[PDB]
Design a protein around this ligand. Structure first.
Ligand code: ALF
Ligand SMILES: [Mg+2]
Length: 219
């Protein structure tokens, strides 16, 4: 049986994406750039903060110094951090708390394998800290998803090899990272985004211990 489950955070445990969207809206409003709506936000999907900022400046063909650029990125992050103070246990996705409990009671290791710089904070706000054996620090990995570094770090932190683990992800790039770590991926979302060579569930309520066992055995 698998010995560990390696969890991505956004789109698996909870959604941060709305707070991000709203942080950018506020920044855009503050600096007087029209066009930062939900539709435009699609183009900020898994895009870095600096690249996202660039797309926003591009809406008004605005040019800035390196220092102004840096300051604007900082302000968006300040907004974001402010907005996430109200994350609560009610923002835990469906199925996830029960999975954590079942994994822990079956002595299966639990690790966070997220690029969120606010991982420990958000887990604490959702009252989930006690279930985690480890959080792989994204500041300490050389390369982000689709590189496997973060999943490898996560597995190692709980005393296992990636090959003894399941990885849970909502992004193609994350799925690819899990593959390359040697862990077994189970995606959540649709095959359009994720690929169709891996097991995928439609939402997180399908992530149960029973289902993960099913998948592990058939592999
Ligand atoms: F929290 Al993620 F890819 F969604 F690191
Ligand atoms: Mg994700």
């Amino acid at each position: 049986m698998f010995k560990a489950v390696l969890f991505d955070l956004d789109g698996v445990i909870t959604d941060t994406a709305e707070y991000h969207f709203r942080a950018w809206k506020a920044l855009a409003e503050e600096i007087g750039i029209n066009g930062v709506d939900r539709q435009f936000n699609e183009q900020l999907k898994g895009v870095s903060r600096e690249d996202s900022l660039q797309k926003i400046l591009d809406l008004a063909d605005k040019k800035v110094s390196a220092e102004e650029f840096k300051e604007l990125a900082k302000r968006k992050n300040d907004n974001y951090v402010k907005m996430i103070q109200d994350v609560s246990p009610a923002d835990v996705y469906p199925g996830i708390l029960q999975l954590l409990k079942d994994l822990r009671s079956n002595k299966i290791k639990i690790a966070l394998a997220s690029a969120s710089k606010n991982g420990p904070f958000l887990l604490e706000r959702m009252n989930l800290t006690g279930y985690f054996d480890a959080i792989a620090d994204p500041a300490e990995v050389a390369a982000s998803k689709p590189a496997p570094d973060i999943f490898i770090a996560a597995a190692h932190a709980v005393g296992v090899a990636p090959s003894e683990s399941i990885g849970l992800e909502d992004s193609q790039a994350g799925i690819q990272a899990i593959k390359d770590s040697g862990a077994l991926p189970i995606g959540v979302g649709r095959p359009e985004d994720l690929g169709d060579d891996i097991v995928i569930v439609p939402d997180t309520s399908h992530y149960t211990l029973e289902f993960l066992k099913e998948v592990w055995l058939q592999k």
